Amino acid sequence: QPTAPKDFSSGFWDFNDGTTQGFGVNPDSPITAINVENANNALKISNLNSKGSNDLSEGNFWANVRISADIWGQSINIYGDTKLTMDVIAPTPVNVSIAAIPQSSTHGWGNPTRAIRVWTNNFVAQTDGTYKATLTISTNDSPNFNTIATDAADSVVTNMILFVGSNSDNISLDNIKFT
Numbered sequence: 777q778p779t780a781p782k783d784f785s786s787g788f789w790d791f792n793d794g795t796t797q798g799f800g801v802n803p804d805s806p807i808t809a810i811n812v813e814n815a816n817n818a819l820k821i822s823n824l825n826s827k828g829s830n831d832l833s834e835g836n837f838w839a840n841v842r843i844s845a846d847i848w849g850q851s852i853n854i855y856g857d858t859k860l861t862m863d864v865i866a867p868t869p870v871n872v873s874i875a876a877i878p879q880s881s882t883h884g885w886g887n888p889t890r891a892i893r894v895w896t897n898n899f900v901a902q903t904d905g906t907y908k909a910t911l912t913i914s915t916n917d918s919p920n921f922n923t924i925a926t927d928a929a930d931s932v933v934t935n936m937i938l939f940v941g942s943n944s945d946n947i948s949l950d951n952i953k954f955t
């Protein structure tokens with residue numbers, strides 16, 4: 777049930793248009809019974825723990841669910857960029873593991889070198905009641921990200937795959953952007 781973006785004028789995924797802005801379970805995901813929807817102007821990913829998408833290690837993110845913006849219909853020039861950052865939102869401080877594989881027309885895949893984790897102690901309470909952590913993926917963590925960001929001949933991200941793991945059946949991603 778992924779839904780195309782209605783407004784991507786910010787140049788990054790802010791999920792403020794009520795859509796999953798192209799995101800949904802990836803065809804090659806080992807896990808599929810994961811819910812991906814828009815809630816509270818964010819990308820809400822439910823049941824990660826119940827479906828075994830809870831690997832929190834650095835190199836076994838292969839066991840986690842893979843999501844991708846297959847019906848995104850947009851793109852982002854990332855030449856010269858060095859980071860992929862996003863806010864992880866949850867009602868209580870949880871643990872979330874994220875590995876990413878940005879894709880371009882000529883650089884379709886690269887095995888992530890490592891997944892980046894934010895642990896409970898990384899979450900800060902928000903006045904809205906929820907807790908939020910800032911997760912950042914460097915080009916050092918994703919070779920395909922480094923390849924695209926350093927390839928002036930083809931530095932346009934046309935899609936992306938995220939490996940998402942958590943010990944919480946309720947987390948949200950928001951403001952996923954390259955900088």
Ligand SMILES: OC[C@H]1O[C@@H](O[C@H]2[C@H](O)[C@@H](O)[C@H](O[C@H]3[C@H](O)[C@@H](O)[C@H](O[C@H]4[C@H](O)[C@@H](O)[C@H](O)O[C@@H]4CO)O[C@@H]3CO)O[C@@H]2CO)[C@H](O)[C@@H](O)[C@@H]1O
Binds near residue numbers: 802804879887936937
């Ligand atoms: O073709 C246009 C279409 O492409 C979509 O992207 C595809 C990639 O093109 C495709 O290469 C990629 O395939 C992955 C596959 O999903 C992985 O599961 C698999 O992983 C391998 C790993 O590479 C090996 O090193 C390791 O030893 O084993 C694992 C599995 O055992 O690797 C292949 C790549 O070789 O899948 C993408 C989609 O999931 C774009 O997303 C889309 O936008 C384009 O339209």
Ligand SMILES: [Ca+2]
Binds near residue numbers: 790791816951
């Ligand atoms: Ca938002």
